[PDB]
Ligand binder design. Structure first.
Ligand code: K
Ligand code: K
Ligand code: MG
Ligand code: MG
Length: 135
RNA sequence: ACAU
DNA sequence: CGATGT
């Protein structure tokens, strides 16, 4: 129904899918960019979406913030819930870096706790998520 | 079908 | 139009 403005919003941006993947997190109320991941040469949209949420979890935990996270990715929200990124991307030399980060993100989820609500951004009702890359 |  | 996902 109502946007929770006191929140963190994350999104992926890519050049190709699979392709170059980046992500960022922003203050939903103001759009202030709070973190930005250096581009990863080969990844999928959903791996980036997943990494972005997990990074948000770690960012908020480190700052003792109870803010929820918005993501527009049904897939990544479920992957974080499951603590398991069920990506189809081939594991080979050129995808090594993204798979390393995904493995480490899962590993972090399996060794830490959090109460952060991970909420679906309702793009159809509210427009594009505030962390969108505008491509 | 829905979410990207 | 193509791809990644439930
Ligand atoms: K975009
Ligand atoms: K499809
Ligand atoms: Mg998105
Ligand atoms: Mg977007």
């Amino acid at each position: 129904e109502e946007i929770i403005w006191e929140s963190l919003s994350v999104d992926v941006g890519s050049q190709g899918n699979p392709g170059i993947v980046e992500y960022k997190g922003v203050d939903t109320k103001t759009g202030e960019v709070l973190f930005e991941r250096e581009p990863i040469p080969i990844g999928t949209n959903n791996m980036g979406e997943f990494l972005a949420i997990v990074h948000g979890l770690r960012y908020l935990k480190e700052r003792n913030s109870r803010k929820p996270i918005y993501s527009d990715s049904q897939t990544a929200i479920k992957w974080v819930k499951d603590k398991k990124a069920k990506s189809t991307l081939v594991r080979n030399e050129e995808t090594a870096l993204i798979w390393k980060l995904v493995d480490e993100a899962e590993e972090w989820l399996n060794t830490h706790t959090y109460e952060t609500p991970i909420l679906k951004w309702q793009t159809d009702k509210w427009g594009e998520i505030k962390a969108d890359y505008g491509r």
